[PDB]
A paper describes a structure:
The insulin receptor (IR) and the type 1 insulin-like growth factor receptor (IGF-1R) are two closely related, homodimeric (αβ)2 receptor tyrosine kinases. Intriguingly, IR and IGF-1R αβ monomers are capable of forming signaling-competent hybrid IR/IGF-1R heterodimers in tissues that express both receptors. Within these hybrids, one αβ monomer derives from IR and the other from IGF-1R (Soos and Siddle, 1989; Moxham et al., 1989; Soos et al., 1990; Bailyes et al., 1997). To endeavor to resolve these issues and to understand the mode of assembly of the hybrid receptor and its mode of ligand engagement, we present here a single-particle cryo-EM structure of IGF-I in complex with an IR-B/IGF-1R hybrid receptor.
The retained 3D class was then further split into “head” and “leg” regions to allow focused refinement of each map volume, achieving an average respective resolution of 3.70 and 3.73 Å for the two regions. The structure described here is similar to those of the single-liganded forms of the corresponding homodimeric receptors. However, more substantial variation is seen across the respective receptor leg regions, where varying rotation and displacement of pairs of FnIII domains leads in turn to varying distances between the points of membrane insertion. Within the current structure, inter-monomer contacts form between the respective α-chain insert domain components of the receptor monomers, and IR domain CR' is in contact with the adjacent IR domain FnIII-2', appearing to preclude contact between the membrane-proximal FnIII-3 domains (see, e.g.). However, the points of membrane entry of the FnIII-3 domains are closer together here (ca. 27 Å) than in [IGF-I]-bound holo-IGF-1R (ca. 40 Å) but further apart than in insulin-bound IRΔβ.zip (ca. 15 Å). The significance of these latter differences is unclear, as they may arise from (1) genuine structural differences across the receptor family, (2) the varied nature of the constructs employed, (3) variation in the cryo-EM sample preparation, and/or (4) inadvertent selection of one of multiple co-existing conformations in the sample. In particular, we note that variation in the relative displacement between the points of membrane entry is observed within the extant suite of insulin-complexed IR structures, suggesting that the source is sample dependent. The leucine-zipper constraint of HybZip is not sufficient to prevent a substantial dilation of the fibronectin domains; however, we see in our structure similar proximity of FnIII domains to those of liganded IR and IGF-1R, further supporting the thesis that the extracellular-domain rearrangements triggered by ligand binding bring about the close apposition of the tyrosine kinase domains. The C-terminal (non-helical) region of the IGF-1R αCT segment appears also to associate with the adjacent IGF-1R domain FnIII-2 in a fashion analogous to that seen in the apo IGF-1R ectodomain crystal structure (Xu et al., 2018).
Author numbering:
A (entry chain A): 578 to 649, 671 to 706, 742 to 897
B (entry chain B): 1 to 162, 168 to 307, 594 to 656, 770 to 922
């Protein structure tokens, strides 16, 4: 037996929050009676601009939607045109020859360790210890027999995101409001402790009898006051909803909080 | 400079950065450069490794399955030109299955002499669609940008804009940058291959890609033609002979290369012979060696189909370079190519939709005969205006003019500098309720269409305020109206953003409002 080929067609799906389904095909050349697969998933942190882009005025929000949908006469060509159209066959051939000379030993911020387990005879595997809507890198190595003496097969990577936590990116508590001169308002709220990936910005919809006026609050500007200050509102009983925006799009809003902009 | 280091053969590095020390002082590599299968490597392993001496390769550069490698701006900070003498299945620069890669970092590469660029299946790779390979490669029809984070996740991967050169492709117009700290330089077509300087002075004809001194065949970074003795030459004088088509060697040099591997057979190197006054691996047919000296000697005497992939580039506001490939089934001796083009109409929703939503950045948005030529330059065009092109190949004379069906592709010219520059001074209106209405004349010919107006105003001594005016706003107010202002003199600036990115900032204008006190 030799080092097996990589697991072919590794797909994944987001079954439920904190859960992920991974479904793949057996390797092309198992090179031996295949014993099992090694499912190794590691957390993937944020990127640079994910904490720098002032998404209130920079650009659209980059989201990574989960691929849950991945759950589910004629005449042959002659030999001349077949040889003429053979263009990418030798390409992938030499790339797999390159990867054939590697191994993966069966070992037992960006400081996230990996979690490795064995899947005996299942091309599908459910992971139930994840974070709602966060990037996860799963590396699978089709281990044949003698995969400990020779080393398991080469790594095949895939990236997936879990299901967002249902109504988690909302404000995890009651908001507070403060009146200020010029009939100004300052709102302060907590941040979701376990957001669906990351709270990129907050949307504050307020207005007279209808949340018509809108305001954006970036990620870092929030920490300057634990919230944001609307500079002017007309004197009167006003209302404002705060529907945050996580990495999974806009979330939920607790309540259109009331505040006294006028005076008694 | 032009002679910074020594010569190295082609090498394959695997499994660790330990063997990468063999190419420390290397400047040129007479072969390929393979760095692949680095599994146990860590990002900190690469942060303290560099090769500033490596400036030029000959065949190509390959990177495949090198974990922890986030960028290359530190590995090859001075790689300038790949000669591309050989090709990896027409690909002159391959980057495949790079896991932790998020950008390119090859800011100093300015030309690939021959081949294509293929970058596929790098799930974390950004900064990939924000680069124009036309100013870098000659033939970009063969290429691969798929299964990448920028094609599916919309990396954004903005460029340094505290300014990067913004090139035009068939329909799109996006800035050019390799990292968030390196703008991709592009130079005028007048000396497409000679090179460039910082001030725009073009390089010498003998240089390639770049030179440290303008119009000097000695201070070149890489030589276009054969190199010899610290100076790029068009053709080396006798007795030196051309070797590997890039540097000329004398008889004594390519002699040792012959005898050395003739007996050692270390890698079966080429027994270079001097034919056509050039030390060539093998002398061409109808010629043999003298059997005593390496100088070779001549032996005694012994309707069509659719035109393929027509892409278009624009290197000017009134010009367009249209390139294509002959159809797969000419179905006859192709006499001349038939080209039709017409001005497209911009999408109607763009004239009325809101743009002050989710950031202020915008998305990437007659006939003629051609005889014995696969390209055509089209003049007399409107700047940045989308043009729908129709191209057909014809294989019969005009009196019997029957030929292929109509192909279709979209073209777009280059934007202009002052086309988006708001003209005329901004005017204001006085009101008793401290409500001001602002008016400014937009140019009648924008690069595409003006989509919004970035308005910035500020009273003397106060803090700068930022506004966003959508299509509908100045469609009704003919501008923008501000309410509840503090009495005093203000300083206002505007920048109109069109389909060709952000325009210019208007000169800070100042107006006076009666303070109702004097
Ligand atoms: C990058 O630099 C190169 C070198 O100056 C530019 O090159 C072109 O150079 C190649 C290399 O010799 C020429 O091609 C070869 O083409 C000839 C054509 O007869 C063929 O006989 C040879 O067997 C070989 O295949 C190519 O013709 C030439 N083209 C032009 C327009 O000069 C290249 O254009 C530069 N690219 C950029 C983006 O600046
Ligand atoms: C999708 O998730 C559900 C629960 O959210 C899974 O239901 C479970 O099935 C697994 C089998 O792998 C069992 O180990 C669990 O005990 C089951 N839990 C419950 C509450 O029924 C389901 O298997 C997952 N996969 C699919 C395809 O539905
Ligand atoms: C051509 O290459 C040289 C060096 O390889 C580049 O010069 C760097 O250029 C800046 C000014 O532009 C100098 O301050 C540095 O000292 C140069 N570096 C070195 C190592 O000499 C030059 O910019 C390149 N030309 C272009 C057009 O990019
Ligand atoms: C390999 O597997 C087949 C069927 O799964 C079995 O019949 C055979 O005995 C196995 N061989 C070894 C060496 O285990
Ligand atoms: C390091 O890489 C070289 C080839 O680059 C390989 O021969 C060697 O086995 C690897 N491991 C060590 C410990 O050098
Ligand atoms: C590279 O240059 C340094 C300094 O001149 C020298 O010590 C070293 O030996 C050179 N590289 C090799 C492989 O010798
Ligand atoms: C654009 O490229 C063509 C092709 O060589 C050239 O003739 C033309 O001058 C170029 N445009 C400019 C503005 O230099
Ligand atoms: C096609 O026409 C060209 C002239 O346009 C001529 O040189 C060539 O021989 C012709 N070939 C055939 C097959 O008709």
């Amino acid at each position: 037996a030799s080092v097996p080929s990589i697991p072919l067609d590794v797909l994944s799906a987001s079954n439920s929050s904190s859960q992920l389904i991974v479904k793949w095909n057996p390797p092309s050349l198992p090179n031996g009676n295949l014993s099992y697969y090694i499912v190794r998933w590691q957390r993937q942190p944020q990127d640079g601009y994910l904490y720098r882009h002032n998404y209130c005025s920079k650009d659209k929000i980059p989201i990574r939607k989960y691929a849950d949908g991945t759950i589910d006469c004629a005449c042959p060509k002659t030999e001349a045109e077949k040889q003429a159209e053979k263009e990418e066959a030798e390409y992938r051939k030499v790339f797999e020859n390159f990867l054939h000379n590697s191994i993966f030993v069966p070992r037992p911020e960006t400081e996230y360790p990996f979690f490795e387990s064995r899947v005996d005879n299942k091309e599908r595997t459910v992971i139930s210890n994840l974070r709602p809507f966060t990037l996860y890198r799963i590396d699978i190595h089709s281990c044949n027999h003698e995969a400990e003496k020779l080393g398991c097969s080469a790594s095949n990577f895939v990236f997936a995101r879990t299901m967002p936590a249902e109504g988690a990116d909302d404000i995890p508590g009651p908001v507070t409001w403060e009146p200020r001169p010029e009939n100004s308002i300052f709102l302060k709220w907590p941040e979701p402790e376990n957001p669906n990936g990351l709270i990129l910005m907050y949307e504050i919809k307020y207005g007279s009898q209808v949340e018509d006026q809108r305001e954006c609050v970036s990620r870092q500007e929030y920490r300057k006051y634990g919230g944001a200050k609307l500079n002017r509102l007309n004197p009167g009983n006003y209302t404002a909803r705060i529907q945050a925006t996580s990495l999974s799009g806009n979330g939920s809003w607790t309540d259109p909080v009331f505040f006294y902009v006028q005076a008694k | 400079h032009l002679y910074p280091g020594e010569v190295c053969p082609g090498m394959d590095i695997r499994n660790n950065l330990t063997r990468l020390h063999e190419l420390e002082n290397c400047s040129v590599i007479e072969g390929h450069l393979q760095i692949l299968l680095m599994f146990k490597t860590r990002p900190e392993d690469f942060r303290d490794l560099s090769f500033p001496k490596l400036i030029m390769i000959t065949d190509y550069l390959l990177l495949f399955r090198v974990y922890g490698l986030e960028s290359l701006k530190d590995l090859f900070p001075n790689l300038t030109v790949i000669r591309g003498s050989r090709l990896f299945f027409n690909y002159a620069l391959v980057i495949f299955e790079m896991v932790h890669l998020k950008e390119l970092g090859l800011y100093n590469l300015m030309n690939i002499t021959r081949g294509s660029v293929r970058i596929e299946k790098n799930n974390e790779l950004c900064y990939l669609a924000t680069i124009d390979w036309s100013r870098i490669l000659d033939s970009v029809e063969d290429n691969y940008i798929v299964l990448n984070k920028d094609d599916n996740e919309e990396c954004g991967d903005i460029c340094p804009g505290t300014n990067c050169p913004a090139t035009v492709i068939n329909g799109q117009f996006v800035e050019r940058c390799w990292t968030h700290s390196h703008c991709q330089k592009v130079c005028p077509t007048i000396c497409k291959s000679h090179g460039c300087t910082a001030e725009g002075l073009c390089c010498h004809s003998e240089c390639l890609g770049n030179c440290s001194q303008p119009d000097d065949p000695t201070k070149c970074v890489a030589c276009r033609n054969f190199y010899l003795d610290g100076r790029c030459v068009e053709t080396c004088p006798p007795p030196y002979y051309h070797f590997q088509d890039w540097r000329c060697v004398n008889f004594s040099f390519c002699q040792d290369l012959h005898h050395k591997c003739k007996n050692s057979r270390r890698q079966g190197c080429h027994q270079y012979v001097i034919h056509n006054n050039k030390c060539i691996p093998e002398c061409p047919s109808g010629y043999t060696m003298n059997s005593s000296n390496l100088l070779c000697t001549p032996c005694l005497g012994p309707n069509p189909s659719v035109p393929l992939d027509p892409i278009s580039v624009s290197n000017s506001s009134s010009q367009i370079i249209l390139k294509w490939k002959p159809p797969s089934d000419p179905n006859g001796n192709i006499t001349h190519y038939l080209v039709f083009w017409e001005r497209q109409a911009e999408d109607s929703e763009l004239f009325e939709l809101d743009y002050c939503l989710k950031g202020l950045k915008l998305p990437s948005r007659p006939f003629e005969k051609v005889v014995n030529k696969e390209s055509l330059v089209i003049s007399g065009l409107r700047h940045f205006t989308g043009y729908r092109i129709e191209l057909q190949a014809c294989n019969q004379d005009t009196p019997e003019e029957r030929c292929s069906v109509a192909a279709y592709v979209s073209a777009r010219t280059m934007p202009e500098a002052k086309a988006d520059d708001i003209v005329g001074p901004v005017t204001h209106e006085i009101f008793e309720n401290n409500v001001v209405h602002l008016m400014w004349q937009e140019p009648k010919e924008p690069n595409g269409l003006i989509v919004l107006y970035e308005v910035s105003y500020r009273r003397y001594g106060d803090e700068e305020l930022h506004l966003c005016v959508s299509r509908k706003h100045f469609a009704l107010e003919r501008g923008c109206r501000l309410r509840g202002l503090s009495p005093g003199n203000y300083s206002v600036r505007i920048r109109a953003t069109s389909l060709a990115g952000n325009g210019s900032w208007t000169e800070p204008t100042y107006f006076y409002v009666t303070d109702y006190l004097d």
